[PDB]
């Protein structure tokens, strides 16, 4: 099978045409401006550019296409999919009372944030006063795929989660559907399934096969996990980027609203996770990547440093333990930079450890393996500390690109996430 994965990030977009029969692949990229007063147009043009940069002999063999977008970015469009107002982005919060959403979701739902799609929809509702039933609200991936198949009000239960969708019971609440917001909600499918055939004009214009299928998309955070290929409960992906992001595959959904922990549905399994403010950003505050490696090469992990740090970049922690007043603990400081770096890495290691432990304490499936992603993944000393502190096999993930995971999503769907 030859599938195309489309990843739409925060600062740009990457496309990966992957060909799983050989295996061979080709990747292309576009970078967004940092400012614009017409983001949908930018996204659309980015889509066409991505399609254009892909070689013809590749486009003529693409069978299935999938699109992942940023979780939280939404658009308000009419019945034809034309943006009526300018999008509300993933980072933008809304000045509304969450108590207004209490009757539409359980009292622990992930949609109960000031950044969630439901909150943004309520905000738009109290700007416009009364949103027409003719209209629709669409996630970025929803809209971008709408550019490909033309079927309106279609979505997956990854992006719909923060819109108020209940993946546990495969539905929206009856109160939400009975409300004045119910008409704008999309039909929710499973990520990977084929929504419909590609538009004939589009296929003609880009030399694509008219029998090509556009599948239901997902989020970038999940597509990144899908790139690893982990499908057994207990398997986890740890992202050692600027901030440490933990993702654990479990047989049971967990949730802790205080720490921002919630679970996505993934086939017959669940994908839980968390995000700490600690990470590689704290490391580059004291060392450039220049000195970082040259100092890490002098660290023997099999002996403790005697240091006990909590490597926060600034005031406030979110996960595993939530306290918005916790100061960074980076004392005492030995003059030997090696042991200081070791202390930092030990701190981060403890962050990851306590994270996974808390995830297990919330009811998630016991940890079995670790697949590491991010810049810190190639750090073998850090890997040693991590394995010493956790006690499970840790290795570098074969792939980390979200577009590739989206390609695997288009080609195979969420089939592997069952036990049959």
Author numbering: 2 to 421
Show sentences the authors wrote:
The At2g21370 gene product from Arabidopsis thaliana, xylulose kinase-1 (AtXK-1), whose mature form contains 436 amino acids, is located in the chloroplast (ChloroP 1.1 Server). Domain I exhibits a ribonuclease H-like folding pattern, and is responsible for the substrate binding, while domain II possesses an actin-like ATPase domain that binds cofactor ATP.
Our results suggested that three conserved residues (D8, T11 and D221 of SePSK) play an important role in SePSK function. To identify the function of these three residues of SePSK, we constructed D8A, T11A and D221A mutants. The O4 and O5 of RBL1 are coordinated with the side chain carboxyl group of Asp221. Three conserved residues in SePSK were identified to be essential for this function.
